Amino acid sequence: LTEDGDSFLHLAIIHEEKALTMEVIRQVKGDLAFLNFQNNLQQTPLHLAVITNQPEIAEALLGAGCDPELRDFRGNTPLHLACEQGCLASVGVLTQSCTTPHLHSILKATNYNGHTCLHLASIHGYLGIVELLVSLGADVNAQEPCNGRTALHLAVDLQNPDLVSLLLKCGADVNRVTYQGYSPYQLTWGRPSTRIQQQLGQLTLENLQMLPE
Amino acid sequence: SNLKIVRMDRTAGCVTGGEEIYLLCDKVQKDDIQIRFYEEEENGGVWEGFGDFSPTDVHRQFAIVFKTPKYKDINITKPASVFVQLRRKSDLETSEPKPFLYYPEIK
Amino acid sequence: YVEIIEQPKQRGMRFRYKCEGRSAGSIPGERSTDTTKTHPTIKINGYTGPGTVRISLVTKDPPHRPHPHELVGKDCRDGFYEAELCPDRCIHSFQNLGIQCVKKRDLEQAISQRIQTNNNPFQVPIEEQRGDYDLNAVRLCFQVTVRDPSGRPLRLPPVLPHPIFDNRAPNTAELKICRVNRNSGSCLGGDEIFLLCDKVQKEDIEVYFTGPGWEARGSFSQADVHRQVAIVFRTPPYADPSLQAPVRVSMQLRRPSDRELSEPMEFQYLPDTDDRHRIEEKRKRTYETFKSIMK
Questions:
Q1: CA A100 to CA A79: how far, in whole Å?
Q2: Three-state secondary-structure class, residue A79
Q3: List of chain C residues whose C-beta atoms are within 8 Å of the C-beta of residue B7
Q4: Does residue B54 belong to the interface with chain C, where contact is any CB pair within 8 Å?
Q5: What is C1-170's CATH number, 3.30.540.10, 3.40.50.1820, 2.60.40.340, 1.25.40.10?
Q6: Contact C230 B6 (CB under 8 A)
Q7: With an 8 Å Cβ cutoff, are B22 and C196 in contact?
Q8: A13 phi and psi, to 5 degrees?
Q9: What is the distance between the alpha carbons of residues C102 and C111, in angstroms, rounded to a whole number?
Q10: Domain range list for chain B
């Protein structure tokens, strides 16, 4: 309603007037039209809540029944943001509350850069969120759209031996290949980490070396 | 002989089209190749759009730089998923579909 | 048949002469790091018993004839290596191997001792060696002999590896960045870039960034080199994480073997801004418009 497309609720949270917010979302009941109002950056009150690390306000917005699946200008659902920022509380609220099978959908959705929640969590090093997302039902072998990479590939790409270990501990398939036909192991050539190359040399012999010609 | 899209710098785009994309692929010939965007419709027909580019945008036979076609409805408010594929002109053979996401224009 | 697992390092090899310090070293693998030095390795596919391997030097280009140069070293004779496949594995690692040269005037002499012992791996007309040779390029021919069903010797057609060049004559390969899908990104690094180029070797190429007292490599896997004609890499983090204004830096293809560079492509590092900062810039720029609404 304001200038940047923001409503009073948006401001209620943006300036961290929890009190006001707690109330606005209380005085104004179950009205989606306003609870799912998106601004010019296509953010909803829920998005702003988690971006500004206010779990409860988000927990409230959800309680009042807002939509957990609306995407921001980057194609992100609030959970995506929660995982991208590493806020473990927000993650909890956004996954504990809507226990609805909508979770499966969210965990399945990628943003405009082709990234799922697990992917965003893995891109930064939030192993705790990564492992939580997996026990919640996110598919560790989910492939990214641009090249068909799995969290495991990204792990090699990010040279993060701890992420690698976690993913293998979660049953990640070391022989899943990218669209170029490559295994995580095969992305190690040219990269410095020998630790990673050790953690992975338990994948098909036919998926270890590059090719010539 | 086989057509394959092995990589794209981006797989989502604005419905308004015109956005530039880098695509890596198996061997193709600059004058016998096209990038077809398509979406199955209710009535069984199909909406299709073609990536815009010139054979000189086909790089050393293994990548194509091109711009996205405009989606059939630049008003949608929710993203619309479609398919993208390489298609050879001489035999109309095509690569396996890749999934492409068209998001609303935020105006 | 036989394949090649650890190709010979085809870049950065000094063809030793009649006397280059008595000896020298061993021709390294296609991935022989200065850390864990490996060597060429073939794999006899479909046979793990007694046999023999012939390491000969043929010519790079299509004519493929016994090259003037002479493979010297352990278990080597008239310009070739002759040893037997130990009856166990098929992961034969030809350790030490060397390369001597045949001066511009000892061709017809080298070609003679090349037919008297006749190396002809392809058996091409021995009467076509009246031609000239490229003394700076040589391929390694692999000739293995195994037992057939009965127990007799078995052919096994020859197999050539990536040509090995000398560190004398310069490198013709042109280094050129033709297109880049993005020329600006966060000073924090990590942005993915598609760069289209002319032919490069995935194992002998790097995306070299340079700026004011700064230089860094753009990281990528060798598998990210698509058909030696495109590279997908990520931008390295800039020298300054708290950039306040754009910084123009250069980006260019660099070939480690001879240190050569392509002309530069400009790249601008930008100050980093996430949604948080953005939201904050929006917060402090809204006290008034909001306090107004509050009442």
A1: 14
A2: helix
A3: 226, 232
A4: no
A5: 2.60.40.340
A6: no
A7: yes
A8: -95, -40
A9: 10
A10: 1-107
> Which H or E element spans position A10?
helix A8-14
Pairing of strands C225-226, C214-218: unpaired
**Residues in a beta bridge with B13:** B102
Strands in B58-59's sheet, in edge-to-edge order, are B5-8, B20-25, B63-67, B58-59
Query: Which amino acid does the sequence have at A154?
Result: L
Domain ranges of chain C: 1-170, 171-273
The highest-level CATH class for domain C171-273 is: mainly beta
Q: How close is the nearest chain A Cα to the Cα of B24, in Å?
A: 10
Cα(A139)–Cα(C215) distance, integer angstroms:
39
Contact yes or no for C164/C12 (Cβ under 8 A) = no
Strand C98-100 relative to strand C153-154: parallel, antiparallel, unpaired?
unpaired
| CATH number reported for the structural domain that contains residue A130 in this entry | 1.25.40.20
Class of domain B1-107: mainly beta
Experimental technique for the deposited model: X-ray
> Distance (Å, rounded) from C-alpha A186 to C-alpha A208?
5
For B24, which of C178, C198, C226 is closest by C-beta distance?
C226
- Of all residues in chain A, the one with the smallest CA distance to B23 is A146
Contacts of B8 in chain A (CB under 8 A): 145-147
CA–CA distances in Å: residue A41 to residues A86, A150, B10: 21, 29, 20
